[PDB]
Amino acid sequence: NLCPFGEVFNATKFPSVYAWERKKISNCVADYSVLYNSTFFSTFKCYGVSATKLNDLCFSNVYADSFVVKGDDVRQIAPGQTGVIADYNYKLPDDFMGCVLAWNTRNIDATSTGNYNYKYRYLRHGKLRPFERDISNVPFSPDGKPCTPPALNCYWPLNDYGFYTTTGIGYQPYRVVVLSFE
């Protein structure tokens, strides 16, 4: 019973960080060879586990979370971070136990003309709880009162990333997979 780790890093389509997707992986045998035989993971950080002694970990479930963010936003995929991505899109718990992988995907997620298909939530009332997910799209107003943009204190809460093939390394798109271990 082979684990679908390959498929997760494999996927042609990745979701926006506000609508990040999770794959439950259980009752299977794990093959982490994709992590080491593909030397492009610019980010490979682990917490409470060892990146290299990784299959000696007997899990009930692993959770794989996939999404896209720009490079300068990758640092917020870590426990105890703050910022718009970590507070309104994807929040790790303080005792997160697993690894975080990320790799530059400019050749497939950026274009010459601009790729505005990936969005993040930049406005919200509360901060997210760890592993919480908010896919609503109600116009944001400081007062909680229904409104309609453009208007008195009123904005749509999602904003587009603009991915161009030809910008600074920190503005290029990065695919992120978060591996969570039970």
Epitope: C46, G48, S50, D95
Partner: antibody, heavy 127, light 112 residues
Framework: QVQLVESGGGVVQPGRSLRLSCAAS????????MHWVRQAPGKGLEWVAV????????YYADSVKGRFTISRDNSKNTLYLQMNSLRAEDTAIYYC????????????????????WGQGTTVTVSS | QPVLTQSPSASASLGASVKLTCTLS???????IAWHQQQPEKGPRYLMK???????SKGDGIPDRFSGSSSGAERYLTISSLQSEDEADYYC?????????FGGGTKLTVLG
């Protein structure tokens, strides 16, 4: 908001012992790697030791191997540095530090991040 | 184990900019590094990790006047619109096998 506060520094005679401590608050201490770094008065920073999240892997700077011993009590969120057979060249400020545990393709194994620094504690070794 | 070569001192006038340089020994040409700042009378502070492809990961609270770039066996810390507080020792640091390596450091004096 994370904080690392060291204790146990002071004056001892060469050839004696001393246990430094490092109190960690504000993060899941038992999941991060932990360092010791020291600075001799007017010298640069010199890395001393690192210990992995579970205490099963320890590495030491050449100049302290055989004498120093790094350990941790995860139940108390505390990091330790046992110094033995102290020398006058062990006079320095000693900081602890924390980091993530990453995989490095150029080493083909673990590297230990150092991304949060402590405040320091001073150790003076003199006859 | 790798060795890091920083120039022992550098200076520029307040409001100017500098590019601190750290060079990896040839055998570890592609190793990633980190930058640390030590202001006078203070402990160190983590700036950013800097990869071989030019990509950086800043710590939280690090101003945008600090950027990292990368070339060959060299690593650069760049500080724009220099302020009085940026006068400090800047240590680049790298990893070996288990062990970590610092450089000598660079005292940056901002003539202000």
């Amino acid at each position: 908001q994370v904080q690392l506060v060291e204790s146990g520094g002071g004056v001892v005679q060469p050839g004696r012992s001393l246990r430094l401590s490092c109190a960690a608050s504000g993060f899941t201490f038992s999941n991060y790697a932990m360092h010791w770094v020291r600075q001799a008065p007017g010298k640069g920073l010199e890395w001393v030791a690192v210990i992995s999240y579970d205490g099963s892997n320890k590495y030491y700077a050449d100049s302290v191997k055989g004498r120093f011993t790094i350990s941790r009590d995860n139940s108390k969120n505390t990091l330790y540095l046992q110094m033995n057979s102290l020398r006058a060249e062990d006079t320095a400020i000693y900081y602890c530090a924390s980091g993530y545990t990453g995989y490095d393709y150029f080493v083909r194994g673990d590297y230990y991040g150092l991304d949060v620094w402590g405040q320091g504690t001073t150790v003076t070794v003199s006859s | 184990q790798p060795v890091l070569t920083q120039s022992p001192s550098a200076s520029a006038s307040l409001g100017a900019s500098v590019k601190l340089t750290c060079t990896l020994s040839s055998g570890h040409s592609s190793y990633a590094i980190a930058w640390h700042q030590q202001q006078p009378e203070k402990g160190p502070r983590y700036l950013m990790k800097l990869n071989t492809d030019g990509s950086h990961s800043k710590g939280d609270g690090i101003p945008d006047r600090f950027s990292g770039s990368s070339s060959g066996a060299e690593r650069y810390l760049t500080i724009s619109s220099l302020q009085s507080e940026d006068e400090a020792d800047y240590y680049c640091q790298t990893w070996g096998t288990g062990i970590l390596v610092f450089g000598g450091g660079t005292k940056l004096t901002v003539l202000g």
